[PDB]
Amino acid sequence: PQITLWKRPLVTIKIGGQLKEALLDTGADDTVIEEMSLPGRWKPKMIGGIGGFIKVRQYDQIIIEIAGHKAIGTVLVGPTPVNIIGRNLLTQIGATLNF
Amino acid sequence: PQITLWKRPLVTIKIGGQLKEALLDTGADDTVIEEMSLPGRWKPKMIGGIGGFIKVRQYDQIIIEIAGHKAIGTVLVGPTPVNIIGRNLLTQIGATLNF
Ligand SMILES: COC(=O)c1coc(-c2ccc(S(=O)(=O)N(CC(C)C)C[C@@H](O)[C@H](Cc3ccccc3)NC(=O)O[C@H]3CO[C@H]4OCC[C@H]43)cc2)n1
Ligand SMILES: [Cl-]
Ligand SMILES: [Cl-]
Ligand SMILES: [Cl-]
Ligand SMILES: [Cl-]
Ligand code: NA
Ligand code: NA
Fold it and tell me: Which intervals hold domain Peptidase A2 (chains A, B) (predicted)?
């Protein structure tokens, strides 16, 4: 699809068996999802943006379905105010910015 | 251009006659630039990033060139980890996300 930017570029994702709404976010290096359980190993991480840093759990090799497209990669889980699909998974679905 | 996302989508901007680097950020509603001098009056604005809310200075109707494209619009000045070009100006340069 071509998504214009008049509005937030929100899509439906499926992660850990759950449907969520998330932002397609070219400004995020990694994907960050609100608190949820995911299976497997994780390690703590700090990530920072406007307003400072939050602590997250880093899960590797997690499969997401993003607007119907499957991608695998790292997901950071923590108290983000918005679910964010970052570049580490946008690349996998072939997303580009065009102008 | 068609910009892939394997690397950060950094571009050159020109504001106040100065060249700066900024991140094209589809997850930002607003354009936020590090401390600099801009003409005219400003108004207060609170924006909510990943780590919490901050105060910024809102300057309206500012001339800014983005990757060689002319835009005139609102620029927020405040403590951001990197200069970000948000949807308010991404729409002025005709940007879309595509996959
Ligand atoms: C380091 O290894 C990694 O890959 C890794 C490391 O760190 C990260 C990592 C991943 C994401 C973030 S971030 O969410 O903070 N962010 C980074 C940018 C600020 C550089 C992504 C933004 O798109 C963010 C996304 C956002 C959206 C809403 C609420 C909160 C955040 N938007 C945002 O702050 O926009 C503000 C300006 O316009 C307004 O509209 C929206 C809020 C406000 C930071 C670190 N990733
Ligand atoms: Cl990854
Ligand atoms: Cl590619
Ligand atoms: Cl450029
Ligand atoms: Cl604007
Ligand atoms: Na894992
Ligand atoms: Na000033």
Answer: 20-89
